[PDB]
Design a protein around this ligand. Structure first.
Ligand SMILES: OC[C@H]1O[C@@H](O[C@H]2[C@H](O)[C@@H](O)[C@@H](O)O[C@@H]2CO)[C@H](O)[C@@H](O)[C@H]1O
Ligand SMILES: OC[C@H]1O[C@@H](O[C@H]2[C@H](O)[C@@H](O)[C@@H](O)O[C@@H]2CO)[C@H](O)[C@@H](O)[C@H]1O
Ligand SMILES: OC[C@H]1O[C@@H](O[C@H]2[C@H](O)[C@@H](O)[C@@H](O)O[C@@H]2CO)[C@H](O)[C@@H](O)[C@H]1O
Ligand SMILES: OC[C@H]1O[C@@H](O[C@H]2[C@H](O)[C@@H](O)[C@H](O)O[C@@H]2CO)[C@H](O)[C@@H](O)[C@H]1O
Ligand SMILES: [Ca+2]
Ligand SMILES: [Ca+2]
Ligand SMILES: [Ca+2]
Ligand SMILES: [Ca+2]
Ligand SMILES: [Mn+2]
Ligand SMILES: [Mn+2]
Ligand SMILES: [Mn+2]
Ligand SMILES: [Mn+2]
Lengths: 232, 232, 232, 232
């Protein structure tokens, strides 16, 4: 079996295991702040430096993975709390879209909301142009921020949220369990064929964005990950 | 929302929140030993005392749940390491089958391998009579120990294993992630309609068993659980 | 070369290869519980029965050894988690100190903290009388629990910890690597001349203790050892 | 804390976590064969792809690490069993020396035996030009294959050898424990200041080589590694 696993309880600038793209900054408390509160259309992304091989063209096998992370979003004065965070999987050459308008593209798509990635978004602003539901929500995104499926959610300012994701290769099912501050859990699941949507080598990471009038604090506090590919 | 959540880092005899059935015993280190190494066809089960309402006949809603636990299985001299552990969900009136032969029934089914329950088994012995795969395995059981679906696995004597289970009401998908001792993960998922297979109120728990020649140490070390039912 | 090697994956009462002193007890899962949770100033020690010859008066050679073991410490209700575990090396006639107060003496020293032994301690309580650091710690002890050198550490209740110790005869260096639950490692090393501090024949083992208000579960799960003395 | 950890029970070609340099080849059984038996002055090296940050210029801290691996060396007909294997640490830009003569340079140094690296060698041939001891040996190399310190050893054809290395940042001590086939252990230790000999980011790996008349099978079977840097 081919296994990749890492665990981050705190991040630090200068660690070769992590890639920073955009307005990302590492706070003194070990947290990663994804966007810059003073920039228009800010965009920040963090990726695990080493590309992970999720499927083999030789065998035809796809990998299974278990990952969990916790984040925090907090409101700032005068600005609309937007736009959210997205945990994504993309090709190893992934870069912030050229001329990204930030906002509802979450730093992973173009103006139409199209891109090459698969991810789970924690959207805190309803962009009608992308057919966003009228409330905060969690959604599964396949090559577009126009979610394949969404579930109502509630973003609480200053609350630490915990997420657990499981991808079962056999069924090609991606299931998410979000544990809110008050104890309640929110789940969403969807069948996504990674082998057909992404290349053999990909990179995992987080991304967040803002606009001119919409800005808020987007923090990533911890992240653990394990993937196992059957090499036989 | 209707939520039930509990967390056990260690168990103790005399705690009204837990039900003991069969040869169960609570070790001094806080662990639960499911079977008696000196009894033929031993069977032990532990259940969470309070019944959980997984679905409402009024609304038609089914609950979602996130639960994780860790166990340990160790070999004893002269005996074949058998038969395994099973995390199950059954009616509130559930009791060890009358005249249970222990062994490959895992303490939840009759001689034919039939019973009323849904669970995830960590089977360490191949019972051909129940169509067991030729190797150790994890499997999804629906009213029978003749698994609906199985995946190869490897039980390591003395290794602490961690499991995470997510059930998404919407898709009715049960996904399992097993983190082995060496770091590799094993996953299995299957669509199971709880509302159609079980009654509104059920009880969750663990069960393990042995035979005459097959016995080993079955330990449950910790268990956390959270379920949320939409009451609207 | 003169070599002594053994490997214990589980312990059993009645095994002539092991010596039990004090409140030691062997659990049904094969683990050794060093202290009695119901006794004031409890003290328990386990020693390898056969004395090992660590140095020769004839040649002047000292032996080298490689040993690794894993333990677990868990909190009990109402009592302060104390006092810790110590892997020690002492004369073949070693016995629990007469009138031992348990507590911060770890079952190897008198009230002043003096004794005849060399060991590595995993101290979970700060005894100012022995100049303990303000936090949990690992330390090298030479004839006293007033550590020659210490390094900060963190004892996690219910966590299985793994330790690897290497003693290189040439440099007379004792190095320890502690692998915590979360993956991080803690190391400490110190030059200790065994030939000058201990007699030719010694015994290796573990020891743990408690007080009136301080008690917790001290478990030893496994232990392997190999020593080689150049006889030429 | 900043921690990097990985575990390889078997290797596979195509795994992005590993870098192959020279005549390296991955056998069907998952082993890595470092040299080509049919090439004159063959040289093969394998490196962990991700660079590890062993020290910080900001804080001044150096990391501690625990790593263990197992190898096998076997004789081939007509050729002298040479030259050996070396576990090394070098700058991230490390490449096989230009115009490497293989042989006694172990694929890490030039003709004079000089290079930029720190490593532990398992030398099976006495090169007088590098002041090699008259017997097989293990040695600590600092920027040269003219070992800073060596200890007698014995390479057994077809024997699986296990090695455990511990580097304690505080003392800057590198200690090695080699467990031979027959059970005896061999140890060697030496104080090496990584911060003064290597840059902040380095790569870890193995290397082996042969000559015209000296060739043998050099196999790497497994490798686990954990390093922890105090980021504070
Ligand atoms: O208001 C938050 C959202 O802003 C939208 O962009 C706004 C911009 O912030 C404001 O200055 C208004 O003038 O013009 C834009 C369109 O209304 C983003 O499109 C949306 O994604 C949120 O960030
Ligand atoms: O509190 C844990 C520590 O106890 C110390 O002994 C205590 C005793 O247990 C407590 O009940 C208090 O009454 O009296 C003693 C000291 O004031 C031990 O000395 C220390 O080693 C811990 O065990
Ligand atoms: O005999 C093993 C050693 O070979 C040395 O190279 C030899 C070469 O093998 C032989 O063909 C004759 O040509 O001369 C060379 C020098 O004696 C290597 O130098 C030595 O490192 C061993 O590999
Ligand atoms: O061997 C473990 C295995 O035993 C099967 O039952 C055995 C029984 O233990 C043995 O003593 C008897 O001689 O043969 C039986 C099989 O023919 C159980 O059925 C199986 O579940 C395991 O426990
Ligand atoms: Ca949106
Ligand atoms: Ca079975
Ligand atoms: Ca103390
Ligand atoms: Ca040589
Ligand atoms: Mn959205
Ligand atoms: Mn089965
Ligand atoms: Mn101490
Ligand atoms: Mn040499």
């Amino acid at each position: 079996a081919e296994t990749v696993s890492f665990n981050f309880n705190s991040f630090s600038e200068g660690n070769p295991a992590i890639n920073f793209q955009g307005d990302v900054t590492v706070l003194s408390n070990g947290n990663i702040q994804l966007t810059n509160l003073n920039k228009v259309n800010s965009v920040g992304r963090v990726l695990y430096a080493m590309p992970v091989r999720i499927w083999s063209s030789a065998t035809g096998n796809v990998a299974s993975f278990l990952t969990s992370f916790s984040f925090e979003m907090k409101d700032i004065k005068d600005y609309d709390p937007a736009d959210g965070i997205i945990f994504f999987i993309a090709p190893e050459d992934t870069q912030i879209p050229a001329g990204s308008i930030g906002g509802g593209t979450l730093g992973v798509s173009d103006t139409k909301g199209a891109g090459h990635f698969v991810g789970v978004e924690f959207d805190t602003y309803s962009n009608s142009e992308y057919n966003d539901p009228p409330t905060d929500h969690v959604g599964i995104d396949v090559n577009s921020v126009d979610s394949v499926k969404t579930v109502p959610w509630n973003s609480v300012s200053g609350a630490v949220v915990k997420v657990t994701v499981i991808y079962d290769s056999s069924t090609k099912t991606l299931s998410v369990a979000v544990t809110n501050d008050n104890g309640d859990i929110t789940t969403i699941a969807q069948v996504v064929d990674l082998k057909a949507k992404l290349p053999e080598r990909v990179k995992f990471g987080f991304s967040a964005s803002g606009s001119l009038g919409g800005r808020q604090i987007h923090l990533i506090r911890s992240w653990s990950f394990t993937s196992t590919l059957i090499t036989t």
